[PDB]
Paper text:
Peroxisome proliferator-activated receptors (PPARs) include three subtypes: PPARα, PPARδ, and PPARγ; The PPARs are ligand-activated transcription factors that belong to the superfamily of the nuclear hormone receptors. PPARγ which is mainly expressed in adipose tissue, liver, and skeletal muscle, regulates the genes involved in adipocyte differentiation and lipid metabolism. The PPARγ LBD is composed of 13 helices arranged into a three-layered sandwich and a three-stranded β-sheet, with the C-terminal AF-2 helix (H12).
The A-chain corresponds to the canonical active conformation of the PPARγ LBD with H12 in an active position, and the B-chain has an inactive conformation with H12 protruding away from the molecule. Lobeglitazone occupies two sub-pockets (the AF-2 and Ω-pockets) of the Y-shaped ligand-binding pocket. Lobeglitazone, with its molecular volume of 577 Å3, occupies 44% of the ligand-binding cavity, which is 10% more than the space occupied by pioglitazone (34%). The unique p-methoxyphenoxy group of lobeglitazone is positioned in the Ω pocket, making tight hydrophobic interactions with the residues of the pocket walls. The contacting surface area of the p-methoxyphenoxy group is 90 Å2, contributing 22% of the contact area of lobeglitazone to the binding pocket. The two nitrogen atoms of pyrimidine ring of lobeglitazone make hydrogen bonds with the two water molecules nearby. The lobeglitazone bound to the B chain displays slightly weak electron densities and higher B-factors than the ligand in chain A, owing to the lack of hydrogen bonding to H12. The binding of lobeglitazone to chain B, which displays an inactive conformation of H12, suggests that the extensive hydrophobic interactions significantly contribute to the high affinity of lobeglitazone to PPARγ.
Residue numbers in the entry:
A (entry chain B): 202 to 239, 245 to 268, 275 to 475
B (entry chain A): 207 to 263, 273 to 476
Amino acid sequence: SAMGSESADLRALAKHLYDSYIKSFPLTKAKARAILTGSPFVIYDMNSLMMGEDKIKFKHITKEVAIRIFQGCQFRSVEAVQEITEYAKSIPGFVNLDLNDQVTLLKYGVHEIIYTMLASLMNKDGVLISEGQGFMTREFLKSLRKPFGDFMEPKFEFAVKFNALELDDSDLAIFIAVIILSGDRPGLLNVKPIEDIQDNLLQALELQLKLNHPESSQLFAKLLQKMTDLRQIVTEHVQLLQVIKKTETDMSLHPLLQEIYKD
Amino acid sequence: ESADLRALAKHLYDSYIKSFPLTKAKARAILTGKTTDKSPFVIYDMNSLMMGEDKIKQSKEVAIRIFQGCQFRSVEAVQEITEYAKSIPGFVNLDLNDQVTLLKYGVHEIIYTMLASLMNKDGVLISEGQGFMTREFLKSLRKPFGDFMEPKFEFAVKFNALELDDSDLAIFIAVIILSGDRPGLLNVKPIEDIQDNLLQALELQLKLNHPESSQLFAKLLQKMTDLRQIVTEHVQLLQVIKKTETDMSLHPLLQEIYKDL
Ligand SMILES: COc1ccc(Oc2cc(N(C)CCOc3ccc(C[C@@H]4SC(=O)NC4=O)cc3)ncn2)cc1
Ligand SMILES: COc1ccc(Oc2cc(N(C)CCOc3ccc(C[C@@H]4SC(=O)NC4=O)cc3)ncn2)cc1
């Protein structure tokens, strides 16, 4: 109605999402970048990985090093799913969707969000682990045997390009909401209300980027192009997950643990 | 802190609806005839059990076949309960060995709690509500399966008299999972801290949802005596079954759960 009210409503939505993102994700990009730019224990080879087991208490140990790193990543992704699920509840409209559509949106959205937020913890030379208490080098991850040596490298390649956009946590809170509210996920029952919510989130993202990054020509479009790129990264990751359970022998052992990590 | 506890209650109820397709509300609707679906098929003897083959969507002997049908239900329930447990705030952040231990020693307490939702004094819903198997038929089975469901029916009658609904049960089942006394837990204190918060939320939920029900919180917590007794008696029955039966193929999930330590 009144002049400026549309801008104000979009800024209020942006602020709400940022405040919720702070409540849901303790290690924000701001906190991560401070750590990366200078202290965490550095894991830079297999010997320092064994020494790192002492300095930090990792929760996933019950094998060969490449397998154990992978299972440590899977433990952390399960924790991330619970944080992202909590965040999703604060996106206006989400909890009023059909319950099956909520589950579907999270099922098919969490991996894109995981790799988006992992970029916040990465620089060109490695990644923060254990809530910022450790740092594992990119070179060490690349040195793992096939097929684990190329598990993290496409994530680093994405992150260096993505981080060059210099998004902050207020930008990312809205970007992550836009990814969750994707009306093209397989099996959704009511697509229209999801696209309606996403329309409002896209309006909020566009205004946030125009105000926060006025010098960054067409940043909104560039960020949508990245959303397209994350789809590719996730499809590649799922391919490797199918390699690790066929090619890499270790299958029907510990059925309860298999259950926690089914999907 | 009251708002946090209500938010926790709401979160657990939502996760419970997402994890368990056959809720108590849906089961009660079926048992009382509310639904717009054909009434469940009633199995009350051998002949009707046989017809249940064709009315409802390996072992040829009756007792074993009933027993194996219970085992496959538990396998399904374990999958649903594990999905629910991961939603309990703090659970997936525990040491992974302790996550496994909590599921190993908690799933059957939850299975029998939720079995009561599908029971009345005369029988129990089976196959997603498609069938109803009578308590008297289950009592008739040959030894060692004589009265093997009777402790479950006795518990359910008393438990259902508490009048809990799904929103109450969601918090109760979380309290069960987060039990710091399970054998072999490595880090008891983080589990007790979560259970403390769940108990606070359960107390508030019961006072708000059942304001007229005196000491319902205490009476619900006392039902763990009944539940642990059911589990110990069932483990003992399994030991008898090992002696009285020939080859007993067991699902890998149940063999892990029943593996001693
Ligand atoms: C000393 O004990 C230790 C043992 C191991 C160890 O390695 C690590 C590495 C690590 N990261 C590299 C940081 C997290 O990266 C991730 C990579 C991939 C995913 C996607 C997961 S994976 C899958 O299959 N499906 C998924 O969705 C998620 C996160 N995080 C934690 N531990 C360190 C210490
Ligand atoms: C039409 O063909 C049919 C074939 C079989 C048939 O019998 C039944 C009976 C039944 N209940 C009696 C209802 C479920 O009670 C249960 C009792 C015990 C358990 C625990 C299992 S047992 C074990 O040792 N460890 C376990 O964790 C689980 C559930 N549920 C499903 N099928 C009916 C029809």
